[PDB]
């Protein structure tokens, strides 16, 4: 029971192939009591999360909605019971308008589109920490999902820029969270075949972008000394759970790579 | 004559202590023919640039203004003469609303403020490249100003996040500029006593932020094996000129540190 | 029981303040069956390890001794029983002759001294992997101890160089270990008050080196958003155990920072 | 005349395809007065350097020879004239025994071989700085040649480890050189078709190593936004000259990448 007795909020579930779905499942398998947040399609999300090993309250959260964020801590407290606080928070949220990715030229993404993507994908990590820190216990843990942006790559375009911003935000959140005895880290995962990504490989963002992303994935498994299985989010979910546990108690403002070791190898 | 015969656009002059003022002066000393761009206070900027060693046309450019950007290449061509192209572009532009810096808590910066700062400080590097690449010669060079954001620090807050985004943007601009035979790099400078920074040390953004920034500067000179003089922008200007020259012809998508070597030393 | 059922070799115990002593203790608390290796003073080491929660066989290993390394796998198999293999290996070994550290000038360390330090501190990580991989199970884990060498610092001198080499060796060991389904990682720890380090703060390597190291420690706790306690090796031991567990199964060739978050913060 | 009036020592010439040969040629084209050092085959080296644009004294230097190093400053002073000092030093020296590279397994390199390679390839950067700093002018520059070792790669094996050590040594040399008003930097170059490398592509170190290195080169040009020509050392030589000039006066303990931008791009 890695997370026995811990109360953990998990955002970012939209389908059963969501990385956050697997994070939630493994966390419950390890004894965590969950509260879920979902964006927009709550009926869908409730139906999806019915399949989790245990029941978990579902709260609505649009990270671009200031009213949602202002009320979030109160709604969470209602859900877990007055006198109880969170031990863990999982940020598994990301989005970039199509103009900011794929075959649409990098220079052709309008700032309003870029700004929306950075809002949801980077700023909201700070938004969620602001909302939830006042209801977190000492020794608590905030975790976000990263895709290694240290080098540029085809197709990912402005989403890669958004991840660069997220990594910087994480280091500042660590400074704030430290006052509460709370850690803040990112997990940089290898590529995972979510619905959206499958759609992209299938050409949803242009044939050229599809081809490059497919090449990107193949080179990843090739580089990874222990391989990489894009169809399996479990090793990622387990890593997130390691950061939510008491077993990395001196790590904060940092990035843990769950990518098969691909980023440490050139060829 | 390091830049003999080169035509170079320099943005970012606002006072005589602007880093871009020193970049422009050294470039002219080295034989460059300049075109300047300025934001908002053009009468002031013209009066300031009258002091440069040579005359240089001044064009208006608000990087948040789409009309300015759409017309920029045409206005530059008018200024340098049909048939002539730029060999160099200097981006020396940065801004973050006060809510995103200083003693104002990190979590209290409203996204609209953050988004404005990222627009001017990061996105606009791509905006300027889009506008100017069609009028740049092969072997050309685009340079932007960076402040090392790889670690978080007091007071700089969201401006540090904006610089993280800028570094990512630079790597993508390099991909685009490469098609034109053009390089794109950043110069990461140590802290420089511009008007704004002097104002901040003087408490303009809060006493606590002032104190931290003053401590930040002192530790910098201490760490730098060859020292660091915050009152002297010349070593920075020379580094920018090195990148505009033909002498780093295989460097692109990169960051050159002009910081006295401070970033490579821990204590 | 984080390590229930796992068989783990732990090197590097010399006193009760050794980092490896705490790694061994926490591992036993979590259900691991240990085999220990020790260098030179085996009577001392046996007497020290008598205090561990459980009994554990002690084998002699001088990593500079080719005969010791050639026989190591056989002696380990004898200790754990034919048919059984290791699930984990901890490398907690480091040394640099005094000429390579402290107030002795950097340029005055003779290569023979440097070479000895690099042999014990970096090459031996590969030596131990070569010896033990043939007797490790798939899903196994090799962990070594690192001190972040990405920036230079006073006093540590050639030991910092040795750590840079170690980090590079780790990435190559990951390539080799991957063929066995085995991971290889380093834990970069903050400074810990071992006997040797206390001796150094006390002036054993010169007053100037003592003063700098004491300053180094103070700045560390200051920078760490969750603080850093140099007198407590437990948070480091727990991190090593996390890497020996099944909970970071997609991380290899990497560095996990157990340093209070100090390395991600500038001031 | 980028280097007009400067006196510069250049090591590492062995054939006309040596990177140091091109560094020397470009430096002379830019007005530098050179002193050369060579290892072992001095008749060959003299005959090769006869082809440089200007005459230059050739001194013998085996960096593993303490007598050579002890006498080096005296011999250089003799060559350039009492009262004159060096403004620049180029370290272009590297070697690793065959057991430490290619298809020979990583684990099978004997430490004595590794230690020799690290001595010549990393330690000697410090050796040369120790010897020459006492005869360098303020504003002087020391430059060494690097091959980016931040990620592991096939075939390069222990030479990659040696480069990791070199990068760490450079940061410490910067600390020492700073007391003399002297800078120390590395140039990380893309792969260059020297004699040795051609031999390796041709299978001199095994067919598998040959194939991997050939693949390595192809991916490099592919990744580089401005391309990479392995048959042309000139862009590398020019970058080294930029660091020897007065145009990067605030850069020390650093690495400048002359690699076509390949290291900043993933695919
Ligand atoms: N799939 C990959 O290859 C991959 C790799 C590394 C990192 N990541 C990251 O993992 C995280 C989860 O992505 P995923 O791959 O599971 O995709 P996903 O589509 O399953 O999940 C993304 C989630 O973000 C939510 N979201 C979008 N806008 C929102 C808003 N305004 N307010 C609240 N929620 C909003 C969506 O509802 C969705 O649940 C993202 O940050 C993603 O960038 C993904
Ligand atoms: N001063 C430092 O310590 C320091 C250190 C490292 C990097 N930098 C960077 O150097 C660059 C120049 O800054 P500086 O220190 O010379 O300050 P500065 O105030 O002198 O110059 C900043 C410039 O940005 C311009 N600008 C703001 N909004 C604009 C817009 N909408 N459109 C066009 N221009 C706009 C301003 O007019 C001004 O000319 C900035 O990117 C800054 O972040 C500064
Ligand atoms: N103490 C710190 O501040 C600190 C910080 C980060 C990393 N580390 C690393 O942690 C590891 C353990 O160091 P420690 O601080 O526990 O010091 P320690 O003195 O307690 O342990 C070092 C061990 O290395 C062993 N050793 C030396 N030469 C050997 C050889 N020839 N063969 C086999 N073993 C040999 C010694 O016997 C000793 O047991 C080292 O790699 C050290 O660099 C220490
Ligand atoms: N060729 C490449 O792809 C490449 C890429 C990046 C960096 N580099 C580096 O550039 C530098 C020059 O290498 P190169 O490619 O020109 O190869 P090269 O063979 O032409 O030059 C290597 C030089 O090192 C010298 N040397 C070897 N042992 C010595 C010793 N004991 N004392 C003094 N000198 C000694 C040799 O005489 C030779 O002149 C090396 O550090 C190399 O690692 C090479």
Tokens of B231: 């009152």
CB burial string C94-110: b at 16+ within 10 A, e below: bbbbebbbbbbebeebe
Query: Ligand 2 pocket check: which of B92, B116, B144 to mutate, most ligand atoms within 8 Å of Cβ?
Result: B92
Question: Is the minimum CB–CB distance between C249 and chain B shorter than 8 Å?
Answer: no
CA–CA gap between residue A17 and residue C53 (Å, rounded) = 44
Q: For residue A51, give the nearest of A25, A23, A12 by alpha carbon.
A: A25
CA–CA gap between residue C170 and residue C191 (Å, rounded) = 21
CA–CA gap between residue A239 and residue A144 (Å, rounded) = 11
CA distance readout (Å), B39 to A167, B28, B79, C40: 31, 21, 17, 71
Q: What is the DSSP string of B74-121?
A: HHHHHHH-TT--EEEEEE------GGGSTTS-GGG--HHHHHHHHIII
Write a three-state SS string for C232-257: CCHHHHHHHHHHHCCCCCCCCCEEEE
Min Cα separation D261/chain B (Å):
5
Q: What is the DSSP string of D27-39?
A: HHHTT-EEEEEE-
Q: Which atom of ligand 1 is nearest to the CA of A12?
A: 39
Radius of gyration of chain C (CA): 18
Residues in Cβ contact with A171 at an 8 Å cutoff, skipping those fewer than 6 apart:
A253, B151, B152, C264, C265
Q: Give the 3-state secondary structure percentages of chain B, helix then strand then coil, rounded to 5.
A: 45, 15, 35
Tokens 């931040």, located at residue: D150
Burial category of B221 from C-beta neighbours within 10 Å (exposed 0-12, middle 13-18, buried 19 and up): middle
Q: For residue C211, give the nearest of C200, C221, C220, C219 by alpha carbon.
A: C200
A116 annotated as a binding-site residue: no
DSSP 8-state secondary structure symbol assigned to residue C265: B
CA–CA gap between residue B248 and residue B259 (Å, rounded) = 18
Residue whose CA is at the smallest distance from ligand 4 atom 42 = D94
Per the CB < 8 A criterion, the answer to whether C243 and C141 are in contact is: yes
How many residues make up chain D in this entry? 267
Beta pairing class for D7-10 and D33-38:
parallel
Beta bridge partners of A37: A59
Tokens 């006060």, located at residue: B98
CA–CA gap between residue C236 and residue D20 (Å, rounded) = 46
Burial category of A214 from C-beta neighbours within 10 Å (exposed 0-12, middle 13-18, buried 19 and up): middle
For chain A, what is the total number of helices (H) and then of strands (E)?
A: 9, 7
CA–CA gap between residue B159 and residue B146 (Å, rounded) = 10
Tokens 């050179």, located at residue: D34
CA–CA gap between residue C204 and residue C165 (Å, rounded) = 26
Radius of gyration of chain D (CA): 18
Contact residues on chain D for C168, CB-CB shorter than 8 A: 149, 152, 160-161, 163-165
Radius of gyration of chain B (CA): 18
Min Cα separation B127/chain A (Å):
7
Per the CB < 8 A criterion, the answer to whether A137 and A86 are in contact is: yes
Contact residues on chain C for D118, CB-CB shorter than 8 A: 115, 118, 165
Torsion of CA A67, A71, A76, A79, to 10 degrees: -100
CA–CA gap between residue B37 and residue B90 (Å, rounded) = 10
CB burial string C183-221: b at 16+ within 10 A, e below: bbbbbbbbbbebebbeebbeeebbeebbebbeebbebbb
Per the CB < 8 A criterion, the answer to whether A152 and A164 are in contact is: no
Distance in Å, CA B249 to ligand 2 centroid? 26
Question: Is the minimum CB–CB distance between C261 and chain A shorter than 8 Å?
Answer: yes
Distance in Å, CA C10 to ligand 3 centroid? 12
Min Cα separation C136/chain A (Å):
15
Residue A91: strand, helix, or coil: strand
Per the CB < 8 A criterion, the answer to whether D3 and D54 are in contact is: no
Neighbours of chain C (3+ CB pairs under 8 A): A, B, D
Min Cα separation A172/chain C (Å):
9
CA–CA gap between residue B80 and residue B136 (Å, rounded) = 12
Which alpha helices (H) appear in A81-223, and where do they start and end? 111-118, 124-132, 157-178, 195-201, 207-223
In Å, how far from its chain's centre is CA B261?
Answer: 19
CA distance readout (Å), C151 to B266, C98, C157, D174: 6, 21, 11, 11
Q: At what angle do helices C42-49 and C19-29 cross, to 10 degrees?
A: 40
Q: What is the biggest distance separating any 2 CA atoms in chain B, rounded to whole angstroms? A: 54
Per the CB < 8 A criterion, the answer to whether D27 and D92 are in contact is: no
Write a three-state SS string for D77-93: HHHHCCCCCEEEEEECC
Residues in Cβ contact with D118 at an 8 Å cutoff, skipping those fewer than 6 apart:
C115, C118, C165, D161, D162, D165
Query: Ligand 4 pocket check: which of D17, D19, D187 to mutate, most ligand atoms within 8 Å of Cβ?
Result: D19
Burial category of A139 from C-beta neighbours within 10 Å (exposed 0-12, middle 13-18, buried 19 and up): middle
Tokens of B7: 């035509």
Q: For residue A264, give the nearest of C253, D161, D188 by alpha carbon.
A: C253
Q: Across the interface, do C215 and B267 touch by the CB < 8 Å criterion?
A: yes
- Edge-to-edge strands of the sheet including C86-91? C58-60, C33-38, C7-10, C86-91, C136-146, C183-189, C254-258
Nearest CB neighbour to C260, from listed A235, A250, A264: A250
Resolution (A): 2.0
Nearest CB neighbour to B241, from listed D177, D247, D264: D247
Residues in Cβ contact with A4 at an 8 Å cutoff, skipping those fewer than 6 apart:
A30, A31, A32
Write a three-state SS string for A28-70: HHCCCEEEEEECCCHHHHHHHHCCCCCCCCEEECCCCCHHHHH
Per the CB < 8 A criterion, the answer to whether B120 and B63 are in contact is: yes
Q: Is D88 left (phi over 0), alpha (psi -120 to 50) or beta?
A: beta
Q: At what angle do helices D157-178 and D124-132 cross, to 10 degrees?
A: 20
Q: At what angle do helices C111-118 and C157-178 cross, to 10 degrees?
A: 40
Tokens of C101: 């550290």
CB burial string B26-63: b at 16+ within 10 A, e below: bbbbbebbbbbbbbeeeeebeebbeebeeebbbbebeb
Question: Is the minimum CB–CB distance between D261 and chain A shorter than 8 Å?
Answer: no
Distance in Å, CA C253 to ligand 1 centroid? 27
Tokens of A73: 């801590």
- Dihedral pair phi/psi, residue C261, rounded to 5°: 85, 10
Per the CB < 8 A criterion, the answer to whether B180 and B248 are in contact is: no
CA atoms within 13 A on the CB side of A31: 9
Pick the residue from chain D with its C-alpha nearest to B251: D258
Helix or strand holding residue A225 (H, E): none
In Å, how far from its chain's centre is CA C189?
Answer: 10
Give the CA angle between residues D212, D214, D217 to the nearest 5°. 110
CA–CA gap between residue A184 and residue A197 (Å, rounded) = 27
CA–CA gap between residue D114 and residue C104 (Å, rounded) = 25
Q: Please tell me if the CB atom of residue B240 comes closer than 6 angstroms to any atom of ligand 2.
A: no
CB atoms within 10 A of CB B153: 20
Tokens of B138: 């092969």
Please, what sign has the CA dihedral across residues A75, A78, A83, A89?
negative
Give the CA angle between residues D164, D169, D174 to the nearest 5°. 135
Residue whose CA is at the smallest distance from ligand 1 atom 32 = A62
Tokens 């020019």, located at residue: D238
Query: Ligand 1 pocket check: which of A93, A199, A231 to mutate, most ligand atoms within 8 Å of Cβ?
Result: A93
CA distance readout (Å), A259 to A98, C113, C167, C245: 25, 38, 18, 17
CA–CA gap between residue D168 and residue C146 (Å, rounded) = 14
Radius of gyration of chain A (CA): 18
Query: What domains are there in chain B, each with its CATH number?
Result: 1-267 (3.40.50.720)
CA–CA gap between residue A131 and residue A17 (Å, rounded) = 27
Tokens of D79: 């060559």
CB atoms within 10 A of CB C229: 15
Beta bridge partners of D265: A152
Residues in Cβ contact with B151 at an 8 Å cutoff, skipping those fewer than 6 apart:
A171, C263, C264, C265, C266
In Å, how far from its chain's centre is CA C47?
Answer: 21
Residue A202: strand, helix, or coil: coil
DSSP 8-state secondary structure symbol assigned to residue C119: I
Please, what sign has the CA dihedral across residues C50, C54, C59, C62?
negative
Tokens 């250049």, located at residue: D10
Residues in Cβ contact with A42 at an 8 Å cutoff, skipping those fewer than 6 apart:
A58, A60
Q: For residue C213, give the nearest of C222, C224, C202 by alpha carbon.
A: C202
Q: For residue A176, give the nearest of A128, A212, A211 by alpha carbon.
A: A128
Contact residues on chain A for B253, CB-CB shorter than 8 A: 152
DSSP 8-state secondary structure symbol assigned to residue A120: I
CA–CA gap between residue A174 and residue A185 (Å, rounded) = 8
Q: Please tell me if the CB atom of residue A45 comes closer than 6 angstroms to any atom of ligand 1.
A: no
Min Cα separation A202/chain D (Å):
19
Give the CA angle between residues A261, A22, C8 to the nearest 5°. 50
Q: What is the DSSP string of chain D?
A: -TTTT-EEEE----STTSHHHHHHHHHHHTT-EEEEEE-S-HHHHHHHHTTSSS---EEE--TT-HHHHHHHHHHHHHHH-TT--EEEEEE------GGGSTTS-GGG--HHHHHHHHIIIIIHHHHHHHHHGGGEEEEEEEEEEE---SSB-TTTHHHHHHHHHHHHHHHHHHHHHHTTT-EEEEEEE-----HHHHHHHTTTT-HHHHHHHHHHHHHHHHH-TT---TT--HHHHHHHHHHHSSSSTT--SEEEEESTTGGGB--
Q: Across the interface, do B216 and C266 touch by the CB < 8 Å criterion?
A: yes
CA atoms within 13 A on the CB side of C193: 11
DSSP 8-state secondary structure symbol assigned to residue A152: B
DSSP 8-state secondary structure symbol assigned to residue C102: T
Pick the residue from chain C with its C-alpha nearest to A2: C2
Q: For residue A111, give the nearest of A128, A124, A99 by alpha carbon.
A: A99
CA–CA gap between residue A235 and residue A9 (Å, rounded) = 20
Q: Give the 3-state secondary structure percentages of chain A, helix then strand then coil, rounded to 5.
A: 45, 15, 35
C127 annotated as a binding-site residue: no
Long-range CB contact pairs, B214-222, < 8 A, 24+: B215/C267, B216/B153, B216/B154, B216/B155, B216/B191, B216/C266, B216/C267, B217/B191, B219/C267, B220/B190, B220/B191, B220/B259, B220/B260, B220/B262, B221/B260, B221/B262
Residue C7: strand, helix, or coil: strand
Helix or strand holding residue C3 (H, E): none
């Amino acid at each position: 029971g890695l997370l026995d007795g811990k109360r953990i909020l998990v955002s970012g579930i939209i389908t059963d192939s969501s990385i956050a779905f697997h994070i939630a499942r493994v966390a419950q398998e390890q004894g965590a009591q969950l509260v879920l947040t979902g964006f927009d399609r709550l009926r869908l999300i409730q139906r999806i999360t019915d399949r989790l090993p245990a029941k978990a309250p579902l709260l609505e959260l649009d990270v671009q909605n200031e009213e949602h964020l202002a009320s979030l801590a109160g709604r969470v407290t209602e859900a877990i019971g007055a006198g109880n606080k969170l031990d863990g928070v999982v940020h598994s949220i990301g989005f970039m308008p199509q103009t900011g990715m794929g075959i649409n030229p990098f220079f052709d993404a309008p700032y309003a589109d870029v700004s929306k993507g950075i809002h949801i994908s980077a700023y909201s990590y700070a938004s969620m920490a602001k909302a939830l820190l006042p209801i977190m216990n000492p020794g608590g843990s905030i975790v976000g999902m990263d895709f290694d942006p240290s080098r540029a790559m085809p197709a990912y375009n402005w989403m890669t820029v958004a991840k660069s911003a997220l990594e910087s935000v994480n280091r500042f959140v660590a400074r704030e969270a430290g006052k509460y005895g709370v850690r803040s880290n990112l997990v940089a995962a290898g590529p995972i075949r979510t619905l959206a990504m499958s759609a992209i490989v299938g050409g949803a963002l242009g044939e050229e972008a599809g081809a490059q992303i497919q090449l990107l994935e193949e080179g990843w498994d090739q580089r990874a000394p222990i391989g990489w299985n894009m169809k399996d989010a479990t090793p990622v979910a387990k890593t997130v759970c390691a950061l939510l546990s008491d077993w990395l108690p001196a790590t904060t403002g940092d990035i843990i790579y769950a990518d098969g070791g691909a980023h440490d190898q050139l060829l």
